[PDB]
Structure 1
Amino acid sequence: DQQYECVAEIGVGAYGTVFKARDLKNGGRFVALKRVRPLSTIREVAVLRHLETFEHPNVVRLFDVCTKLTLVFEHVDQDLRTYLDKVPEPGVPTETIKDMMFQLLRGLDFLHSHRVVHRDLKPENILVTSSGQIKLADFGLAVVTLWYRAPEVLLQSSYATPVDLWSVGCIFAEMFRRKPLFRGSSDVDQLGKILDVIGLPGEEDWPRDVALPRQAFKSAQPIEKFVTDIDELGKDLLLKCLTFNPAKRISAYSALSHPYFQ
């Protein structure tokens, strides 16, 4: 598409390639062009176009779709990862953590209410604008990072919307620590490091018929030992996100009404 001129590679992998490009027809503004090499794909881009009609402030704008598939998004200069690496001591200000978490949960509630599950939420696809706005990116299309993966994904049992609320809890903790809460090197090591903190759940909370039984893995530790800067209300919301059983985990909609945000 000669309407765009690629100037830098943002990333490459399974998702094809994402480039930073000049939108030659729209005043030369920067855009992120995702080049991705059917019915599943056709339906997925139709869902992305539908979400864009709402123009939610907490998800990246989808400017164009070309067809061999190219998605054109607004460009955001930085991700949450870079924002956390550059924030000076003593860290992210308490009210900035609160604001970014509120916006993250609004973008996620928007996706969950239109039955889209992100499934790969991490600082790398949580974008931070020059005005401090949070914009979700890299969703809707089907070292590594299991650090934000929910226990039910690691166990290979369920994949519903609560999967993103576990990721939100990991990210919430990381905004205080400025280092990942659960840094595992494999699916089983990730689950062990999770249970080292939250403790073994009740036998009835363990999913039936999975390869890994409860027996393969522990007592709950005070979460403030790992997130020292967190307040009482923040702690209550953090634990509601880091609940082992997905049916008992708080939703993004209820999280938005938690006393922490009042």
Structure 2
Amino acid sequence: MENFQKVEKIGEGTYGVVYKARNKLTGEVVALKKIRLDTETEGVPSTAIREISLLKELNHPNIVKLLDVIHTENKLYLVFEFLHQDLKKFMDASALTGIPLPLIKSYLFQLLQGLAFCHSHRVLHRDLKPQNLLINTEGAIKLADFGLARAFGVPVRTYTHEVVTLWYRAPEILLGCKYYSTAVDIWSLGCIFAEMVTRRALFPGDSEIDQLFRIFRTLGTPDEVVWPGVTSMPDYKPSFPKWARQDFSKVVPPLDEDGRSLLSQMLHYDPNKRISAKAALAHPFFQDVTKPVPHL
């Protein structure tokens, strides 16, 4: 623990605080997460049990690497490979010019590759958003902050409901479905794909019913035709306004035919029709995919 020189704070996620640090001895630059344990109360938080145990086996280029767990009795510390920026800051730094399409393509391809690896190792991330996606200077993007992650089962079970950040949260959650699985993570990436293309968040509500309405106003109010079962879901209400589906060429104008195809599959209301991460990798949108380096 004495080998680490904290440089600054770089984030504060689901739990604890994260610093940029340097190994005094090797010069390696790392991200240091601090979780306080203040003995008297409840022990090590479940948020950390999950994140550490899951990350120990989520070793992939598009997931942030956990290098070490330094476990004092007063604190718990996680050492991660350092990434210099999140997708949010990158999206703000190119509000005007927009991110170039090759870079969108490649980031999406990479995010799908990292998410497929999770799903295929029975982990749900459950908090995908622009500030949890980390980039380096070489063109990579990685999934980060697994504080809200869990190991799911085949078949799934009721899991925690208070899940995913409001703007990125799938409708089966908003409407209160008994069950959700890997599809909730795909919805979030759909939202993120769209945000990368237009500069602005896709569905930026400020309450649950506002979030619903915002989704409805764009994708059309869901009904039995589009999503068998909606009208019988626990928090579905008959008095929901009936907005017509907006056309994708107005939701997401810069996208070509392939991209709209892909985006509509990530954003299907029905979780059983929502494309998988692995299946998405096979989509024609990705045939000409490269690895562009940002002007960073």
TM-score by length of 1: 0.90
AA matched with 2:6:
C
- Among 179, 183, 204, the alignment partner of 2:200 is 179
- What do the CA deviations read for 1:71-124 (whole angstroms, capped 9, x no partner)? 111111111111111127432111111111100100110111101111110110
2:65 aligned partner: 61
2:121 aligned partner: 114
Cα RMSD of the aligned pairs, angstroms, is: 2.1
Which structure 2 residues correspond to residues 1-262 of structure 1 after superposition, within 5 A? 1-12=1-12, 14-25=14-25, 27-37=26-36, 40=46, 41-42=48-49, 44-52=51-59, 56-67=60-71, 68-87=75-94, 89-139=96-146, 141=148, 145-157=165-177, 158-203=179-224, 204-206=228-230, 208-217=232-241, 218-262=243-287
Query: C-alpha distance in 2, partners of 1:17/1:219?
Result: 44
Structure 1 vs Structure 2: percent identity of aligned residues?
51
CA contact (8 A) 2:166 2:211 kept: yes
Runs (4+) off by over 4 Å:
38-41
**SS of the residue aligned with 2:236?**
coil
AA matched with 2:235:
A
CA contact (8 A) 1:116 1:140 kept: no
2:154 aligned partner: none
Distance of aligned partners of 1:207 and 1:15 in 2 relative to their CA distance in 1, 3 Å threshold:
farther
2:40 aligned partner: none
Query: C-alpha distance in 1, partners of 2:130/2:275?
Result: 20
Aligned-residue offset at 1:12: 3.1
Query: C-alpha distance in 1, partners of 2:200/2:267?
Result: 17
Aligned-residue offset at 1:24: 2.7
Aligned-residue offset at 1:152: 1.5
CA contact (8 A) 2:7 2:19 kept: yes
TM-score by length of 2: 0.80
Structure with larger RCO (C-alpha < 8 A, sep 6+): 2
Greater helix share, 1 or 2?
Answer: 1
Aligned-residue offset at 1:202: 2.3
Distance of aligned partners of 1:230 and 1:13 in 2 relative to their CA distance in 1, 3 Å threshold:
closer
- What do the CA deviations read for 1:124-157 (whole angstroms, capped 9, x no partner)? 0111110110111101556x94111111122232
Q: How many residues align?
A: 257
Comparing 118-127 with 36-45, greater Cα deviation is found at 36-45
- What do the CA deviations read for 1:170-200 (whole angstroms, capped 9, x no partner)? 1111111011111111111111100111112
